[PDB]
Amino acid sequence: MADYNIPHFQNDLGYKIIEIGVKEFMCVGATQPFDHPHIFIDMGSTDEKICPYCSTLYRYDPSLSYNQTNPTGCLYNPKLEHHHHHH
Numbered sequence: 001m002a003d004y005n006i007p008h009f010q011n012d013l014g015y016k017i018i019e020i021g022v023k024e025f026m027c028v029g030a031t032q033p034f035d036h037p038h039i040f041i042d043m044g045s046t047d048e049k050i051c052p053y054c055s056t057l058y059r060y061d062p063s064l065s066y067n068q069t070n071p072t073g074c075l076y077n078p079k080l081e082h083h084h085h086h087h
């Protein structure tokens, strides 16, 4: 990994069960009482991980891979905010 930037997903309203094809995730929230954007999530040996205080159960399923995700684009997409690794 470079610059330590793991995938982020976006809750439009917040689906109770989200299917993701990545085992590294960092929950968004920005201004939260929790430390960091919201909470840090990893799968590893547990392909089933819900996010505390969200209801957005991130489920990893063999039928979907890193190039796929859940119904509706719940993936957070950076549009113009991109840095080309500035030294």
Ligand SMILES: [Zn+2]
Residues within 6 Å of the ligand: 027, 028, 038, 039, 051, 052, 053, 054
């Ligand atoms: Zn969360």
